[PDB]
Amino acid sequence: SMASPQVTAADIEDLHRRLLAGMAVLVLLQDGTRLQCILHYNEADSSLSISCEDKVRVIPLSDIKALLHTRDQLQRVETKANLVDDESCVALHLLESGNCIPLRFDGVKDKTCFVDLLKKLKAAA
């Protein structure tokens, strides 16, 4: 087909449900390593957690300054990993440290929904 799908509210809500239940992602390390992780949203204190190899990192929503999702945005990240070629990555640009955590989702649709959902949680905060 000439045409591409676009994400709906249902798509975004489905990702929301999975984020609350915890979902599988990878983190892409600066040296090129890939960590298998669980990504979770905690709506009580409005924070994301990323849990990999028995270690949990908590990022308050208010520490997430920006989301890097476009090819050009992600090309600015200093790393040996390939963040852009699968167009499945969002990096959390953090306010305090100014550094970035790149998350790779299962594919383009989840990657796309995540960006919208995060905006929604941030804008409603």
Side-chain angles (χ1 to χ4, degrees), residues 44-60:
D45 81 353
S46 75
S47 63
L48 283 175
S49 58
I50 302 172
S51 178
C52 329
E53 291 169 6
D54 298 346
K55 283 159 60 118
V56 173
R57 177 167 185 171
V58 169
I59 303 116

Side-chain angles (χ1 to χ4, degrees), residues 90-106:
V90 191
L92 317 172
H93 187 204
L94 311 174
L95 185 39
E96 184 178 308
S97 75
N99 296 317
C100 306
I101 299 177
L103 304 173
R104 180 183 289 169
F105 292 81
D106 290 11

Side-chain angles (χ1 to χ4, degrees), residues 8-29:
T8 57
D11 289 338
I12 292 160
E13 169 64 22
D14 183 82
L15 181 58
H16 192 211
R17 182 195 97 255
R18 290 178 279 128
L19 198 48
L20 296 174
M23 66 188 291
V25 296
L26 309 183
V27 168
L28 313 163
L29 298 180

